[PDB]
Every structure is written in structure tokens, then in C-alpha cells.
Design a protein around this nucleic acid. Structure first.
Ligand SMILES: [Mg+2]
Ligand SMILES: [Mg+2]
Ligand SMILES: [Mg+2]
Ligand SMILES: [Mg+2]
Length: 86
RNA sequence: GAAUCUGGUCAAACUUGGUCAUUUAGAGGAACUAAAAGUCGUAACAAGGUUUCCGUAGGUGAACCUGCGGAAGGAUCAUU
């Protein structure tokens, strides 16, 4: 219930994927993704992991930025928005 | 011939408005360099992995991409 998980997938040594999973489907994804792209200056994607967790994919270790964005916009509590160190 | 006074006259100045320039405030806004063990890509240099470039229009994390027409500064100085 409301568990939004941010998870780093390390690809090639230092080059990384910030995968944000479980974002609410009331305010649409595309706009949010675009905003993130503008802010992060890094590429973002929409991933459909076996139709259970819809993922906003981002490039690079900018989890802090994601957190900040959440605080600004939709992630109100910072309790059910969880961070993986990996 | 003294103050004084009518008309001029040159007219400082003063109240007005509007031009300008030196300036310093400049709420905020976008730039640019210098720093070059941040972040993401890798665009260009090799046919640099879609050859690059120009002019232009559109698009968009960002290098940029794509139309259309030109260049080669091309990777062709070549067909009885
Ligand atoms: Mg080729
Ligand atoms: Mg390249
Ligand atoms: Mg190339
Ligand atoms: Mg030259």
C-alpha cells in the first residue's frame, strides 16, 4: 500500500540506472518524466515490469534529486517513499 | 541734480514640464567566461561505428536529430 521504491541498478561500474517504482497513476507519468529530464539533465524511461510495478527509469545516481522532487510534488509523507542503497 | 516712478532693454535667477548622459541603487531575469579527480550521455576527430559541413524550418534532457537545397573542407581528381 503506497510503497514507492527508488532502486539503483548498477550497470557498468560507475554508470547507473535510478529506477523509481510504484508511482501513483492519477497524475500521468509522461509529464513527470519530462520534468525530471529537464531538472536532472539526464535521460528517463517508462518501464513495464510484469504489469505490477510501473517504473519511471532515470539515468545516474541522483536519488537525492528524486527525493526532493517527491517532497515538492506528490510524495507528501516521506514514509512510504523508500530508498534502496544497493 | 538726489531718492522715486512710467516704458523699454539686456537679462541672472525662480516655478514648470520634457530630452539626455555620466553614475550608483536593480525586486528579479537569463548570459558568459575562469576554475575542469561533479552529473548524464558521447556529438566531433578513423567511413568516429547514420561521412561531415552550410543555409533554413520543426522538434526536443543534452550534446543534437530530422525535413528540403547546397557544399566537399569526402571516404570518389576513373568508364571505350
Ligand atoms: Mg558507414
Ligand atoms: Mg560520435
Ligand atoms: Mg558520426
Ligand atoms: Mg577553415
Amino acid at each position: 500500500s503506497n510503497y514507492i521504491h527508488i532502486r539503483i541498478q548498477q550497470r557498468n561500474g560507475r554508470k547507473t540506472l535510478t529506477t523509481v517504482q510504484g508511482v501513483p497513476e492519477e497524475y500521468d507519468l509522461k509529464r513527470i518524466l519530462k520534468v525530471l529530464k529537464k531538472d536532472f539533465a539526464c535521460n528517463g524511461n517508462i518501464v513495464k515490469d510484469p504489469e505490477m510495478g510501473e517504473i519511471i527509469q532515470l539515468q545516474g545516481d541522483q536519488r537525492a534529486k528524486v527525493c526532493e522532487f517527491m517532497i515538492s510534488q506528490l510524495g507528501l509523507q516521506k514514509k512510504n517513499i523508500k530508498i534502496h542503497g544497493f
